[PDB]
């Protein structure tokens, strides 16, 4: 569930 979200 997204470890490093880019927005």
């Amino acid at each position: 569930l997204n470890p490093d979200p880019s927005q």
């Epitope: 997204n2 470890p3 490093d4 979200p5 880019s6 927005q7």
Partner: antibody, heavy 116, light 108 residues
Framework: EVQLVESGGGLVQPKGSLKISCAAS????????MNWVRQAPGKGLEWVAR??????????YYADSVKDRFTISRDDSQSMLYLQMNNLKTEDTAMYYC???????WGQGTTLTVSS | YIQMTQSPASLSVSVGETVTITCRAS??????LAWYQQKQGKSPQLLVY???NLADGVPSRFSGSGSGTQFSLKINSLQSEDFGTYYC?????????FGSGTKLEIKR
């Protein structure tokens, strides 16, 4: 389970330096964004700094009161998160938290005390 | 920078009573918001992520709702264990600022 253990905290003379640490295990460290959060005694939670994963070029974010003075880093080889704190001020006295991603897991904290 | 203003500062609450802590964002933060429960002497624990999603190992009585600017956590039939300080955080652009806190006490 997922665990983050903080260490390194202690008494530091104002205008001094300390490098607090965070050891991670039970999850794939190198794919996660990581951050530090602080809490002054009796006060609320203040976000300090963040660092993105290797795949996103390790891009870093800081708080205005901490910028140029604190540098967040990570050793992916050892699953370690660090906070170098230079030129410490009194208002930097706090419990420092190592937090994963957007806040699903927090460590137990080390205390920092800035006092002469 | 986006300011989050939390209300109320403190709550005195009887067991089985239901309560709602609200959190308003200065600007539109969409759904990038989390709720935390901290107990004195301990580290915070994630209660709701993305404004409306209940986190693992959190009782069903905890309800997250809201989008845009006005968010609110709701507790149904507050249990003795639900004592603590409740914080909200947004994550729409650095710095990810926190609420000022809601101190929750058990009525006795």
């Amino acid at each position: 389970e997922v665990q983050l253990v903080e260490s390194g905290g202690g008494l530091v003379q104002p205008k001094g330096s300390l490098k607090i640490s965070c050891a991670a295990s039970g999850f794939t460290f190198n794919i996660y964004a990581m951050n530090w959060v602080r809490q002054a005694p009796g006060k609320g939670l203040e976000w300090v700094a963040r660092i993105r994963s290797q795949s996103n070029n390790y891009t870093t974010y800081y708080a205005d009161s901490v910028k140029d003075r604190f540098t967040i880093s990570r050793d992916d080889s050892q699953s370690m998160l660090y906070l170098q704190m230079n030129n410490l001020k009194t208002e930097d006295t706090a419990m420092y938290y190592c937090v994963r991603q957007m806040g699903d897991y927090w460590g137990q904290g080390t205390t920092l005390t800035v006092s002469s | 920078y986006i300011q989050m203003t939390q209300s109320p500062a403190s709550l005195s609450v009887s067991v089985g009573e239901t309560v709602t802590i609200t959190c308003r964002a200065s600007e539109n933060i969409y759904s990038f918001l989390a709720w935390y429960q901290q107990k004195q002497g301990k580290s915070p624990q994630l209660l709701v992520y993305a404004a409306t999603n209940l986190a693992d190992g959190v009782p069903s009585r905890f309800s997250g709702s809201g989008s845009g600017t006005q968010f609110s956590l709701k507790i149904n039939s507050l249990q003795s264990e639900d004592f603590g300080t409740y914080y909200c955080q947004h994550f729409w652009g650095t710095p990810f600022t926190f609420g000022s806190g809601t101190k929750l006490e058990i009525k006795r």
